[PDB]
C-alpha cells in the first residue's frame, strides 16, 4: 500500500508538456526549448519540491493534414547549437540525437539522460546569472534541459501538430515546499499579481 503517493507515482506520469505546430508550402521547421514550466498543472506538482532529478522519456504524438509524410525529430542537448534553418548543418550533427519517423508507424520514443552540470534541477533558484541590473533571477538561470526540433524531410501545402508527451523516470526530489496558492503568470517566475 501507499506506493501511489511515492514520488515516482506522483511526478512520473506521462503528460503533454508542449504543443509544437508548423506549416509548409526556414518555414518547414520548429523548435521548443524543453521545460516543465509551460503547463500549470505539471509545473505545480514539480514546484512542491526545491530540487528534482530524473531521466526523461519523450513520446511524440503527431497529427498532420494537407504519400506518407516523413519527419525528423531532433534532441539538441544543453549548450549545443539549435537550428536556424530547415536544412542547417545542425540537423546532420552526430552529437544531436535524431529519430526519423514516418506516418502510420508507432509513435517515436526516446529517453534523454539527466543532462545538467549540477546534480539536480533547480525548481527554484535564489540567485543570478551575473552582477548586472539586467541579469536573470530564478530557475531560468540554471536548468537548460535542451531543445526539441522538428522538420519535414519530404519535399512539399501541409499543417503538422506534435504533442510532446514527457514522463520523468528514476525520480528523486528534495526539500518540500508549500503548494502554489495563486495563479501562475509567467514561466520560471514566482510572480502572481494579475
Amino acid at each position: 500500500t501507499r506506493d501511489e503517493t511515492s514520488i515516482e507515482s506522483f511526478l512520473g506520469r506521462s503528460g503533454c508538456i508542449a504543443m509544437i505546430e508548423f506549416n509548409t508550402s526556414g518555414k518547414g521547421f520548429k523548435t521548443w526549448k524543453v521545460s516543465l514550466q509551460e503547463m500549470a498543472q505539471i509545473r505545480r506538482k514539480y514546484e512542491l519540491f526545491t530540487y528534482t532529478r530524473f531521466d526523461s522519456e519523450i513520446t511524440i504524438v503527431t497529427a498532420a493534414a494537407a504519400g506518407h509524410i516523413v519527419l525528423q525529430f531532433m534532441y539538441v542537448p544543453p549548450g549545443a547549437p539549435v537550428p536556424e534553418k530547415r536544412d542547417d548543418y545542425t540537423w546532420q550533427s552526430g552529437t544531436n540525437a535524431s529519430v526519423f519517423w514516418q506516418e502510420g508507424q508507432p509513435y517515436p520514443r526516446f529517453t534523454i539522460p539527466f543532462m545538467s552540470i549540477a546534480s539536480a534541477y533547480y525548481m527554484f533558484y535564489d540567485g543570478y546569472d551575473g552582477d548586472s541590473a539586467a541579469s536573470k533571477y530564478g530557475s531560468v538561470v540554471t536548468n537548460d534541459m535542451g531543445t526539441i526540433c522538428v522538420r519535414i524531410v519530404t519535399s512539399n501545402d501541409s499543417n503538422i501538430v506534435c504533442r510532446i508527451y514527457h514522463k520523468a523516470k528514476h525520480i528523486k526530489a528534495w526539500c518540500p515546499r508549500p503548494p502554489r496558492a495563486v495563479a501562475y503568470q509567467h514561466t520560471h517566475s514566482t510572480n502572481y499579481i494579475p
Partner: protein, 230 residues
C-alpha cells in the same frame, strides 16, 4: 546557560531544543576549512517587534558578507559552502503576548510586487545584515503569501520553530548546506532565507514596553572555500 564560538559568547538556556533542518547535521564535504576564526556567532542589530510589524527576512550567506573573517572569505574565494546555527531570541515580560514563526527557506526565490514577467533586482534580493522589514523590480510585501505565492499557514513545511512569548523566548535552527552542487558562488546565490513572521501580533497594555527586541545571532558551521585570492 552560556554558548561560546570563536571569541563570541551568547547566553540562552534553550540551546538543546534546536531544530536540525531535515534531520541532517552540518558537515564538511565528503571525499566523493578555517574553523573557529570563521565560525563565530555574528549578532545582527535587533528588530523592533510591534503590533504593526508584518515580519522580517534575511538571505544567507548575504547577511554575513560584511561579517569579519567569514565575510572576507566570501570575497577572497571564488566558491564557498557552509551550514549555519541561527539563534533567535525575543526578550519580553510575562504581560506581553505574541507568536512568531521562525523559518529557514531553501532557494527562497522572491516574487516581485508587480504584474509583468519582470525579475526582482539584485539590490533588493541582497539587503545584507539589515535584512528587509516588510511594509518596479522590488519583491512582494505579502508575508501571508510567503513573498512567493504560497500560503503562510503552509510555511511549517520548511525547517521552523515557533516563539510563543508565554512559553519560550527563543528558537534555534541548525541548517546544513543545501544546494544541487557541492560548492557555489557565495555572492551570486543564497542557499537559505531566514524568515520571521508574527502569526499572532504583539499585544501589551499601555505603560508596558511597546516594542520588544528580536535578536538574531548567526554562526557559520563547517564553512569551506575554494579558489583563494589575495
Amino acid at each position: 546557560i552560556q554558548i561560546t564560538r570563536g571569541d563570541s559568547t551568547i547566553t540562552s538556556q534553550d540551546t538543546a531544543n534546536a531544530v536540525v533542518a531535515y534531520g541532517v547535521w552540518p558537515s564538511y564535504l565528503t571525499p566523493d576549512q578555517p574553523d573557529t576564526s570563521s565560525n563565530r556567532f555574528y549578532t545582527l542589530d535587533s528588530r523592533s517587534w510591534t503590533s504593526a510589524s508584518s515580519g522580517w527576512w534575511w538571505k544567507l550567506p548575504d547577511a554575513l558578507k560584511n561579517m569579519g573573517i567569514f565575510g572576507e572569505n566570501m570575497f577572497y574565494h571564488f566558491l564557498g559552502r557552509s551550514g549555519y546555527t541561527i539563534h533567535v531570541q525575543c526578550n519580553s515580560s510575562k504581560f506581553h503576548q505574541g507568536l512568531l514563526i521562525v523559518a529557514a527557506i531553501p532557494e527562497h526565490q522572491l516574487a516581485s510586487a508587480t504584474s509583468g514577467n519582470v525579475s526582482v533586482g539584485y539590490n533588493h534580493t541582497h539587503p545584507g545584515e539589515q535584512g528587509r522589514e516588510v511594509v518596479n523590480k522590488r519583491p512582494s510585501d505579502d508575508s501571508w503569501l510567503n513573498f512567493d505565492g504560497t500560503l503562510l499557514g503552509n510555511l511549517p513545511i520548511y525547517p521552523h520553530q515557533y516563539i510563543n512569548l508565554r512559553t519560550n523566548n527563543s528558537a534555534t535552527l541548525i541548517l546544513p548546506y543545501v544546494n544541487a552542487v557541492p560548492m557555489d558562488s557565495m555572492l551570486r546565490h543564497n542557499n537559505w532565507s531566514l524568515v520571521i513572521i508574527p502569526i499572532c501580533p504583539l499585544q501589551v497594555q499601555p505603560g508596558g514596553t511597546q516594542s520588544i527586541p528580536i535578536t538574531v545571532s548567526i554562526s557559520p558551521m563547517f564553512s569551506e572555500f575554494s579558489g583563494p585570492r589575495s
